[PDB]
Each structure stands twice: as C-alpha cells, then as structure tokens.
Amino acid sequence: LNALRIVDHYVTYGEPTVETIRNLIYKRGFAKVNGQRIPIVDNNLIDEQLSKHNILCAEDLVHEIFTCGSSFKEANNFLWPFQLNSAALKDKRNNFAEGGDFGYRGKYINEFVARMI
Amino acid sequence: THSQGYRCKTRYCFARKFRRHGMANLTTYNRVYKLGQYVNIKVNGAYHKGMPHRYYNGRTGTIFNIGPRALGVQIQKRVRGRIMLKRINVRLEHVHPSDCRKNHLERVAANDAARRLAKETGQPVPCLKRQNALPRAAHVVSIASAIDITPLKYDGV
Amino acid sequence: KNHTSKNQNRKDHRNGIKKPKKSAYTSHKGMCPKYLRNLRRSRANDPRQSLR
Amino acid sequence: SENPMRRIRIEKLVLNICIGGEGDALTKAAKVLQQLTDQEPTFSKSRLTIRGFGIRRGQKISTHVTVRGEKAREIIERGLRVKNFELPYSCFSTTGNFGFGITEHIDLGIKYDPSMGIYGMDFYVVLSRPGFRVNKRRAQQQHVGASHKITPDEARAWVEREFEVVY
Amino acid sequence: PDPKIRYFDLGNRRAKVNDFPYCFHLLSGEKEQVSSEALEACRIACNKYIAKKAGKDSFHLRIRVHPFHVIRGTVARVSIGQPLLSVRCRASAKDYVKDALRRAKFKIPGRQAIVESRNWGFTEFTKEEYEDLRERGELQYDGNNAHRISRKGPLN
Amino acid sequence: GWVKVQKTRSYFKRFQVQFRRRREGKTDYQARKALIIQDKNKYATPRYRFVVRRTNKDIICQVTAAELTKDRVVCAAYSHELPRYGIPVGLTNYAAAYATGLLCGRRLLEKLSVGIKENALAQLYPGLDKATGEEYHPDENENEEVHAFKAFLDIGLARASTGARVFAAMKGAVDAGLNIPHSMKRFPGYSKDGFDSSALRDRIMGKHVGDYMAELKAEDEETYRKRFSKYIAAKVEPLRLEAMYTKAHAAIRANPQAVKAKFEIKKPVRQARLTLKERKERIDAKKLEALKQ
RNA sequence: GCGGCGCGCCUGCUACACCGGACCGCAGGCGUCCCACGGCGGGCUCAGCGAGGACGGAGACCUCCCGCGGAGCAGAAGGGC
RNA sequence: CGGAACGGCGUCGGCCGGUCCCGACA
RNA sequence: GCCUGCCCCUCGCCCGCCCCCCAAACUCCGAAGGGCCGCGCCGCCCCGCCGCUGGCCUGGGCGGGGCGGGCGAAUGCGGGCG
RNA sequence: AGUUCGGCCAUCCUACGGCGGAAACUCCUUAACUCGUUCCGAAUUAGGAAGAGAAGCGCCGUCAGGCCCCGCCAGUACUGCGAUCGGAGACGUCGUGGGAACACGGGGUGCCGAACU
Hints:
The structure is cut from a larger assembly and holds chains A (117 residues), B (157 residues), C (52 residues), D (167 residues), E (156 residues) and F (293 residues). With 117 residues, chain A is mainly α. Chain A contains six helices and four strands, in the order H-E-H-E-E-H-H-H-E-H. In chain A, the strands form two sheets. A two-stranded parallel ribbon of chain A has the order 1-4. A two-stranded antiparallel ribbon of chain A has the order 2-3. Helices cover 27% and strands 30% of the residues of chain E. Helix content of chain F is 40%, strand content 9%. Chain F has twelve helices and four strands. In chain F, helix 4 packs parallel to helix 11 and helix 8 packs antiparallel against helix 9 (221-227). Classes of the chains: A mainly alpha (117), B alpha+beta (157), C mainly alpha (52), D alpha+beta (167), E alpha+beta (156), F alpha+beta (293). Chains in contact: B-C, B-F, D-F, E-F. Chains B and F meet through loops of B and helix 3 of F. Chain F: This is Ribosomal protein L5. Chain F: One of its GO terms (molecular function) is 5S rRNA binding.
C-alpha cells in the first residue's frame, strides 16, 4: 500500500466484489504455465499448477483471491495480468476524490472494471 | 567548486557537537572490535590522524583488517555504474560499532527461543515470519460519547 | 555546455549498479603482514596442510 | 567563627620596585631587595614597548620578591612605621588583600650606601586563612567557600588589631 | 548607498502604554520588495497627515519593515501579512489615522491592507486582555510595552 | 563600576562541563589513555595498571584492569594494614611505601598461585629475599613457559621526583616479582655514572626518619616529643626502625593474605528532600513574609 | 582585441542537509617562513573583567579573585585544541 | 479579447456597523 | 545656582530590562527529502593448528568432528562473467 | 557512610545560604633529609600528627540561572508527489503523503560497577 501510493497517478484501485473476481477469472483469466499465457477454460489446468496449494478448481481460485488466503501469492502469480477493454475515464489527471479517476475508487472499482471485462 | 582539497565543504561535517568539543571518551579505545563486525564511520574533528574522507562519513563497513592503532574497514562506494569495495584504514576515534544487524541477531535468537518454548508447552509452533502491518480487524467502537464536529468560520481578516 | 550531469544516471543504471565481485571481500590486500604470516603457519598443519 | 581555622594569616608580601630604561638602577634595586627580604628577587620584563617611559619589550623593567612567614610580618610593620600606622580605608581590595607603598629605601631602616641609589618599593600583602590551599593544589582543586574567603571589612579589623593601623 | 529612511519610530515615541489605546496596521497584500525610497515617501505622508489633522503627541508611528537587502541602493523583502507600517493613537487621532494610512498606501507598491488592531497599542495583549490584567495589577508596565509580572525568578 | 556579570545566562547555556573525575581533579585522562590503551590485535587480553595513590594518612597501592564500563581491582594492599606486619607508625614514610608495594605484589602473585601448584607464579618469581637498593628486573630472566606478571605504574597527579614515594611502592612490587618497567633515575642512588645501592637501601630501611629522630631529640627534646609523639607512644626505638622494617618485609612474604577486617557502618540520615507541595508551601510563606514589612 | 586568468593549487560561500554539480559568479589566499616555529616529557594557564598596590597618569610593574577560551597556535579562510 | 496600479450610483451576490411605526421641532 | 565648589541639574557614557526588523559566506534547534548498511543459518559440546597475543591453563584467527532445532518481511523476477 | 580506581559525561553545572563528619577523606603541623620553587616548602618533594570542620567534601534549601523531560505550540511553518487548479503575475489552492522550530506552561535535578575499611 505504500508502494501503490507512489504510483497512484498511473493506477486506479478498489476492493473487488466476488462477482467481479468470478467474471475476471472466468471471462478474462489466462494462466502463466511455462511462462506462456494459457487460457483457463477448464478446472484441470488450475488443478495441475495449484494442487500443491489445494486450489484444485475455479471456485477455489475465486475464493483464495477474495479471502486473501494462505495460498494467495501462488494463486495470484498463476494468473497472467488481466488484459481489459479501454476504460471510460472521466479524468486521468486527477484523483477520484478530486472527481477524476486515479487513486482509490473503493467499491466503484467493481463498476469501473465491469465494462472493461 | 573551483578548489577540491581533502577537507573542503567540511565546515559542519568535521565539526564537534554543541557541547561535545573535547577529548574522546576512553570507551572508544576500550571497545573490542572483531573481523567482519559492522562499523559506522563518523569523523571526529579533534583527531587529525587516521581521519577518513567526507565521503566515508555516514558509511557502514566490515573490518577487513584489525591493526595496532587503526582498523581497516571496507565500504561499498558507487562510482558511476559500479559499486567498488573501498578499503580504508580509520583510527578508533572515527570508527563506531554499528547496531546494523542487531535486529537480525535478536530475531534469530527469539525465533529459536520461541521454537524450544513451544516444544515444551504451547506445542503449536508460533509464526516466526514478519508480517508487514496487515489490514485492521473488524472490531466494535462505542459511539455513545460521539461528539459532533463542524467546520469553523474564517476570522483571519 | 561546459558541463552536464543529465542522462549520466540513466547510463549508469542501464546495465550497471554492479556488485564489487566476490574474492574482493575476502582479499588479503591491506591486511596486517604479521596476521597473514600467522594464518599461513596455522594453515600448514594436518587437514588444512596442502604440502606432501 | 571562633574556629582556630578561621584565623587570618599574612600568606605573602610582594616587594616590587619598577624602575624603567636606566638599566643600572634595576640591578641595584634587586640588591637592596635581596638584603631586605633575605631572598633573591626575580626580574619582570616589559609586556609592551612604550616610548614615553622608554619601556622596550623585554627590558627587565621590574624586580620583585615574594616574602612569606615571619619575615613578611617584620618587613610590613617596618614599612607601616614609615606610614605611621595609617592606611587608606579604600586601600583594601574586595578580595581582602591590601597594599601600601613607600619612597626611599632608607626610610624602612636600611643603611645608605653611595653606590646604590635610594629606590622606593610597593608593598602588597595577601591575607589568607588555613584551608585556602584548595584553590592552589594541583590535585582536587576547587574554589574556597564564600564564608571562608576573607571579606574586605574583616580584613580591616584584622590589620587594625595586628598593627593598630587607623584608617 | 544609505537607505533614504533612517527613522523608523516617529510621532510620540516616548508615550506611555495606556496613553494610546487604538492601534492600526498597514500590512502587505502581496509578497514583494519595497524600496527604501518608497518607505521614505510613505513615512513622510502618513506622519504629516496625522500630525497636521491632530498632533505629533496624539500618535506613535512605526515603520515595521526595514530596508536591508542591498540590490546589485537597498530594498526591503516583505511577505503577505507582514506589517509595513503601524500606528498606535488616542481617540483624538483614531479617525485621521485610517485616512493617513490610505495616503501612504498610494506610495507603497502592490496590494496593501488597513486593519484595526484588537491588540492594545503595540502590546501583545488584546484590549480586553490588557484591561483584565490591568484590574488585577498583573500587567506590570515597561516603558511603552506591557508584560505579565511573572511567577519566575527569585521571589525576593 | 557598572559592568555585566561574567557568568551570563549565555555563558551557562554554552558552558561544556568537563568529565566528572576531571572536574573533581582526581584523574588525568591524557595519562589514562596511554596507560589503558592496548593494541587492537591484542583484543581483550587484560592490561594492568599499578596505581599508587598517597592519602595523607596512608599509601593505597592497587592493581586495576580497564573494563569498558568499570575498573576491576585484581588486588589492593593499603599502608593501614602494616601494623599487622609490625610497622606501627610512619605509615606514609618511604620505607612503608616500599612495604605496601611488596604487600600488593606478594598478595597478587599468591592469589594467582593459589591453586596452580605445577608452575605457580609466586614459586617461579620469588622476588628479592633481602630489601636492597640493587636494581632487580624479573623480566630479565623468565621461565619462558610462564612470564613475570606485567603492570604499568600509574602515579595520577603526582610529580615524578628522585626519592618520590610513588617509586618506592613500584620498587616493592618489583622486589615481590611483579615486572614493572623502570629506569631507576627517579630513585635515591642514580648519579648518572652508576647507582649507589647503599642510598636506596637506607631509604627502604627508614634511615632518614631515624637519623632525624636522633638529631631532633638531641637538639630539642620538646620538639622531638611534638614531632614524633606517636613513635614515643608506640615505644618504637629510632635505631630499631631498620630491624622493624626487615621483620615486616619477611612477615609480608610469609603471609601476604588479607586479614579481611570488617567494621560497623554509621550513616547519618540527614534532611529528607522537600516534597513539591512542601516547596509550594514555602513559596506561600515567603510571599507572606515579604507582604508584611 | 584590450585587459584579466576557474591556465596548477587551497578555504568559506553561491550549491538546492549522502555524494556529485556550471559561472570572465562572491569574499579571500599559495609558489614562502622556521634546526626551531621540530620531536618528546614535565610543569603551567590564556585573553581579560572587577577590586587593589611610592613614583606611574588611558598606559607598563606587582597582586589576589572569577575566569568555555572571548587568547594563542608563521602566513587565506573554515574547522580543531 | 496579453495586461497593471487605480476609478465605476453597470448588474448581481455577500460581510459588518447601524438607525425604521420614540414614522426612519412640527 | 558659584570665596570657590562636582552646591545641583541636563543629556551622554555605562550597566540592567524591554523592543523593531534581520543574514549566501551566522546557528542554540531543525524538517520534508535523501544516503549507507542489515533482513538465515543458529545454539551447545568437543578437538586440532599457529615463529601470532597474554601473567597464565590467555586470546584471536583458521579448520575438523558431533548433537539439537531450521528456511524465519512484502512483491516481482534466472543470474553472473569475458 | 566513606575511600581508591573507573564508566557515561551538567537531572552531574553555577551562585548563594544552611547542615554534618565515628571511621575515612581533607584541611592541617614541620623542613633533618630526598626533591622543588623566572623569587617564595604558595604549589611541589619529604617527615609528621598538636589541632579543626572553617573551607574542599557529602546532605538539604532557593516563585534561583543553566541543564534534563513532557505537553502545548501546530497539523502551524515548510516540503515529497499529482493537478488543461485559481491567479497577468508572484503567490496561493486542492487531492495524496510527511512534518518542525522559537516561545509558553508543567515538572525533575546523576546513576552505574570493582576493590577496601
């Protein structure tokens, strides 16, 4: 959180809802197997790389990410960074508190990413 | 910067503190130093032999050589795109032992201690990893004494 | 321009900020001769000894 | 107090004769100080060169002996016989140490010798009590207590009893 | 060169603490450098107007800012809310002072502010605080300034 | 006549107090630094100082090591212990200083040798059986498996003179067998072209006090009573001083162990510190006393 | 070009609290002086206030006190004691 | 309409001190 | 003001206390901001060696053999060298 | 309690006023020596033991000065970062981070560790 504040101008952040996590993991989720971007279309790929961490299926994946559990680092690293459609962005120059878009959007990140997925 | 002598821009760096002008406390000459100990380098203005350079002030190094009167200490100095191990000989008055890894030495002892204590009673092993703050728990706070606060009016002019 | 330090820190950090290499930390350069002679005398006995 | 320790004593008498650029008179002034005090006097040189009194830096313009003990008492009283046992009330210092000066070495009682001319001298007397060594000792040196320090008024009383001096 | 303004205390400099009740201050609206010539011309105008309309005795005028920065004759560095000119005056001169300050403002460069001082005279204490301390007698007087008799130091 | 006080508030604000023992005047830190400094390559090997301090009543001789936050006294013998060895008076005299030094050296060497047995320090370094003006250096010949204990003379704020008593305790340490480096220039006997053992022997045997005692008694009996009342009261014959001193040196060597005497502790309780309320109450009284004149 | 010399070297700056930063930017120095103005050990306290002491006064000389250094340490400046 | 100190009873919006039915001498 | 007079006054001087505005070449304080170094192998016992250190049966280094525990900030990412 | 040696060096200092001392410390009392005084046993070197707390020294005090600590000062002054923020500027503002100082008030006023009696 201290590092994120240094890069606030370049990013928008918020707490994600479980439905927002499910839609990202299912509709836009791609694995990082052998440094390749392998699409997550089945519960078999997640089992193959995350059985050691007990993340056998997609429901385990959208649960670990949401509860920030013990195997959060492994679960998060398994996912290639999501590639999304272009954001609406009212103003890229100012913070969401000043009425722009950068910085903490809080619950509004769920709405912001919705269109992008 | 037309002139670059060994002691330039040292007006404040090699000057003693407000009430610390005088002769080094005998502890500086009584402290035992061993090879590989981390030592902070801070010049003392009163002593002019074995004095390091203004760059070396504020640097922490390991004692490569211990010698009759001066200890040789090796610091890492970033010269352009390379950090170089600069071995310097500094008299006792300008070398002070560094706590530096003292936190790590305490942690190694405490982690081992809380492991044995568990083997005896309170058997579940304690978490021996640092956690970087983390988020706060939910908790509950009484708002019975809550006081309303309001923006105050301007009065400056 | 008589002098510029611009770009110098981009060039330094392009493939640089390099460690001084090992065998520089454990070098005997500038160590007291009397200590070094004692080390060699001690090393030349039993398991540490490397002579025939 | 009536403590024996709080008894004032004549710690030292300084007999200084300052002449100037004449040179010969300084050596002769030392000889009459040597014969009065009974100890050899030392010479103080000049700190500055001043044309008006011919003072030149390092010209040995003074001669002085520090007389201590019974000898000091005898010389002070002989000098005070010239002053007819009368001293100014302000001739005493804040430290409790007083002084007087006389012209003519003959007036003290020294016999006249033609080779050596008559030279006057300044008599400064320091008053001290037992226990003042704490200021002068090399080890554990601390200032004398304000009560134990001689006061100007208490010094007048001591000398008005010892020599019956009237101010 | 020497600053044109050598006198910073004009009017009744030796007046007593309670002799003058109302204080008015001309502060600086903008951060700027004010010339010594500008401080000498404003100092001539305000002093003359009040002295003409009332008396030299009726007011004590202080040019708070002093020209120190030699410019390669000299200039005064001033900030927003730093008092340029100040005056403590009795009721006989209260009305004239505000209009004199407005005749000094046209000489000084930049925005200027004329305010009444809640503080009594040149003393730190506000007029109400001055009065409360005066009734107790805690307000010991020193020259023209006023201070608290204090509970510090040797009692005797 | 009207002048500012030399000790202004600014003077006190900028005043730097000297070290506690420098303010007291008890120690010179320049001398101490050289006496306490050891080579860094020697690490924590202990460095010993033979400290000889002379109070008006007695001579205190001690062996001290410099720890980082304290000084450790390995052994300490005092001149006040000399009556147990047969010297009743003149405990600050030159001869007594030599026997106090002998006592510290024998006491320390014996404590090191208390359990060793095979090569005891005292057995290996016996010392000079007779008290003599001859220069003795234990280090000159050494066992080579054990070396003579080495300590360095610390005189504190004392002026080093020929005949000074600080040197006499160092000669007694040397005579016991402690190796204290010396030149013997500051000893009664050095005359540039050689050392007169006889002159030091005499000071060690107390001849100076005893010749004075004989001369003073003959010239003025009353002054002899005033000057040497304690000797007359201790029934000590003037000529007998040399015999008493030699017997004492033997008595020190035979048993240097401390008697370990303990006495009563009397502590005055003194005044209790005023409470804050009591100080405030004094202020109210002081205000009231000034209010009525 | 005329002149000067950031043409070798040094101190305090401007220089923006590691270090590094340009200036025909600023206030100044250096090319010498000393077999003592060196080395070491011992002793000592300095400049000065105050108050005192024949000549002797603003001024020497001798005195006590209190003296964080207000003195000195060859020469610039800053540290140091 | 790049623009300043200064002016404006242009048109709005406030802030503060007051006096209005003791009609703001009859 | 007066045989004179220092007989007294007035400002200075000089101390005391306030006080207006300060400083690139002032600093009793003192930021933000930077810099340097650390963040895994420990604890305990034993033994060997040394013209090196100590009064020693002392250290300090350099090894060897055990016996107990072990991976002890977050995030990203294979590093190094010629 | 006191002494010697220390550690850190003012909560330890400075001024002044009290209060003690059995022991210790000190002051002290003398120069036959030893040694020492630009002159002087003042200091020092030695040899003492007739005195004494009067000092130094401990202990307490003082609307004391200093020093030390905590509040307030003040989220102030500054400043890191982002701003097609305001403003002609030079200055301020907002969002997101840090954050003094001088005053002022309230108190405190050395401890530690070896030996010895």
